[PDB]
């Protein structure tokens, strides 16, 4: 040995870079780790491997060891001199062990360590100055543990950290300046905890934070500390118990791109709450009954998808579409809308859903110049009259739903050759509709069957599999019509 050592018995070795060795001794059911172990090792995998105690017979001098994996072992503790000779250690993996605390001194002064995995353990205590002397540490996993409180003291030295996970723990409170010194931190995961109360200055530390995950938690109020994270881009606090989004909630966080707050019992949202988020692309608000006014979206014109349902919106501003260019899908279903704005300024609109509103009439300009619009749903309204030219300028329109709207007649100008047409619930609609001036219709809903009767009722390899599936759907589909 001492230079000429072979591949450890029962293990599997393989060359890395020239004169460097990768040793795989995973799932061999070792009681203790390999004995006569070789220098030139740059990768050591001992995983799922019944190691009760790492050694009485230490193996330093592996100064070329880049990566140590010690997962699925039965380690209850880590001795102080365990990782002494490992000067080139970049990544250490210690997940799925029975560790009850971060090694008090064993992890100290590993100069080159960049990523540390201590997840899936039983750790409940994180001794201060256990991470002391880790200048290269960028990534820290501490999830699926039994933590109760943020180790603010232990975290105070890791000013080079970029990514941290404290998920799947039992953390209930976040004190002020809990992550004070973590200035380089970019990604913080606190999801699946028991966080009920957090301080007002609890996030004041991390200036470079871009994503914050407070999902699957127990928040009763919107976390206002959020206001201090200027560089924040992604925000998650869904599946909590938050009741409302306050006015000026994301004021401190422009350049936000995604926000997740679903599975929250949200009833009210401030009007100016979603102002000044120009990088935001999608806004979804379902079942916020206490909303009585359409939200203001000044300085956030890059919305592509706006859906807001189950509220009490009585009317839309005349110049509502002035705030919404680039908008593709609009869904104001289940509201109390009577009059409709122009919607012409809202080009690039592809889909519109206004069902279950109190709309009594469709004007001329209310749908003019929507050349990209494909789907229009106005079902379950009280639309007595439609202007003849209302749908004159919608070439790309293919789906139209006018179900249950007490209509008697119908505008046929334009609208020729669409794909879906739904007219059930309009009892006063008894006249006939031709197969001509209506080709390409494939799905039809009709108030009366005799109207349905008028429509004839009574190179690459193996991608051909895919072509077969595309061709299966169409052409096997004949014209449908339900009365």
């Amino acid at each position: 040995g001492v230079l000429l050592r072979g591949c450890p018995t029962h293990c599997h070795c393989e060359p890395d870079g020239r004169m460097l060795l990768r040793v795989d001794c995973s799932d061999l059911g070792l009681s203790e780790l390999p004995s006569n172990l070789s220098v030139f090792t740059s990768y050591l995998d001992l995983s799922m491997n019944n190691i009760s105690q790492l050694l009485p017979n230490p193996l330093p001098s592996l100064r070329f060891l880049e990566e140590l994996r010690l997962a699925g072992n039965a380690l209850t503790y880590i001795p102080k001199g365990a990782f002494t000779g490992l000067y080139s250690l970049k990544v250490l993996m210690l997940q799925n062990n029975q560790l009850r605390h971060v090694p008090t001194e064993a992890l100290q002064n590993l100069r080159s360590l960049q990523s540390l995995r201590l997840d899936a353990n039983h750790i409940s205590y994180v001794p201060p100055s256990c991470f002391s002397g880790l200048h290269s540490l960028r990534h820290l996993w501490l999830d699926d543990n039994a933590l109760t409180e943020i180790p603010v003291q232990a975290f105070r030295s890791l000013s080079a950290l970029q990514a941290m996970t404290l998920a799947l723990n039992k953390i209930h409170h976040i004190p002020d300046y809990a992550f004070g010194n973590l200035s380089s931190l970019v990604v913080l995961h606190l999801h699946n905890n028991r966080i009920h109360s957090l301080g007002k200055k609890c996030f004041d530390g991390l200036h470079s934070l871009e994503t914050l995950d407070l999902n699957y938690n127990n928040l009763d109020e919107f976390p206002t500390a959020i206001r201090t994270l200027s560089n924040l881009k992604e925000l998650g606090f869904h599946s909590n118990n938050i009741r409302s989004i306050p006015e000026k909630a994301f004021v401190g966080n422009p350049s936000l791109i995604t926000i997740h707050f679903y599975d929250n019992p949200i009833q009210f949202v401030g009007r100016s709450a979603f102002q000044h988020l120009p990088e935001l692309r999608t806004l979804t608000l379902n079942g916020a009954s206490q909303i009585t006014e359409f939200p203001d979206l000044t300085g956030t014109a890059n919305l592509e998808s706006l859906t807001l349902t189950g509220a009490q919106i009585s009317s839309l501003p005349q110049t509502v579409c002035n705030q919404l260019p680039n908008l593709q899908v609009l869904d104001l279903s289940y509201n109390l809308l009577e009059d409709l704005p122009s919607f012409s300024v809202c080009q690039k609109l592809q889909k519109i859903d206004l069902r279950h509103n109190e709309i009594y009439e469709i004007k001329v300009d209310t749908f003019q110049q929507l050349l990209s619009l494909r789907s229009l749903n106005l079902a379950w309204n009280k639309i007595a009259i439609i202007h003849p030219n209302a749908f004159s300028t919608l070439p790309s329109l293919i789906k139209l739903d006018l179900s249950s709207n007490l209509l008697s007649s119908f505008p046929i100008t334009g609208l020729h050759g669409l794909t879906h047409l739904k007219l059930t619930g309009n009892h006063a609609l008894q006249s006939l509709i031709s197969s001509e001036n209506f080709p390409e219709l494939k799905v039809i809903e009709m108030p009366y069957a005799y109207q349905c009767c008028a429509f004839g009722v009574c190179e690459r390899d193996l991608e051909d599999f895919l072509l077969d599936f595309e061709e299966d759907l169409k052409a096997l589909h004949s014209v449908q019509c339900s009365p």
Binding site: L429, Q430, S431, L432, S435, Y450, C453, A454, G456
Partner: protein, 104 residues
């Protein structure tokens, strides 16, 4: 298009009739053709509407001609007519038949 018709299609026949006439759709082929009549043929009854006047099949047991649905105008022979419907035997009171077959 056709006699007493204003809007027709060669395939489906007449689609809209003159102001006060009735549309008849059959539906005996498996194909539907529309005819325009001054009044509905036997088996059907006349129903007027501000949009479309239509001949409606009278689905009443043992009814030859009817005023609307649920009310028969003349019952089949061998069957008595009482208050717009038809029985072999009359329900109550008179309910007594004369030389005629119409439970008074």
């Amino acid at each position: 298009c056709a006699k007493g018709c204003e809007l027709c299609s060669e395939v489906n026949g007449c689609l809209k009739c003159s102001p006060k006439l009735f549309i008849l759709l059959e539906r005996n082929d498996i194909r539907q053709v529309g005819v325009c009549l001054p009044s509905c043929p036997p088996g059907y009854f006349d129903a007027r509407n501000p949009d479309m006047n239509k001949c409606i099949k009278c689905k009443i047991e043992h009814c030859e001609a009817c005023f609307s649905h649920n009310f028969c105008t003349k019952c089949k022979e061998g069957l008595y007519l009482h208050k717009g419907r038809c029985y072999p035997a009359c329900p109550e009171g008179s309910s007594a038949a004369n030389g005629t077959m119409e439970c008074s």
